[PDB]
Amino acid sequence: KASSPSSLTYKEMILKSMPQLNDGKGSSRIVLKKYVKDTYPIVGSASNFDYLFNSAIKKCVENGELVQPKGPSGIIKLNKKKVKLST
């Protein structure tokens, strides 16, 4: 599907990959991480990334960017609903 760019925020990185994974319906952290690390070589090389990855999602859920109904382990859903040119 849509190729992932580079040098985005960890939030934007997921926001780009999410719609690709299951049409942005949602994907497990392993699936997402594997995808993010694969499409973004910088996060692939970075071992510390994986922690920041979890931190990014944590920031996303309050932001309404991503939603994680299960919790830490579960499935990251591309919410991206509280922003859609609603005017």
In which domain, by residue range, is 36 found? 1-87
- CATH number of domain containing 82: 1.10.10.10
DSSP-based three-state secondary structure for 65: coil
Structure tokens at 82: 């509280």
Instruction: Copy the structure tokens of residue 65.
Output: 């960017």
> How many Cβ atoms from other residues are within 10 Å of residue 4's Cβ?
19
Residues across the chain: 87
What's the total number of domains in the chain?
Answer: 1
DSSP one-letter code for 37: H
- What span, in angstroms and rounded, lies between the C-alpha atoms of 63 and 25? 17
3 CB burial (10 A radius; 0-12, 13-18, 19+) = exposed
| Experimental approach | NMR
Positive or negative torsion for Cα 24, 84, 54, 43: positive
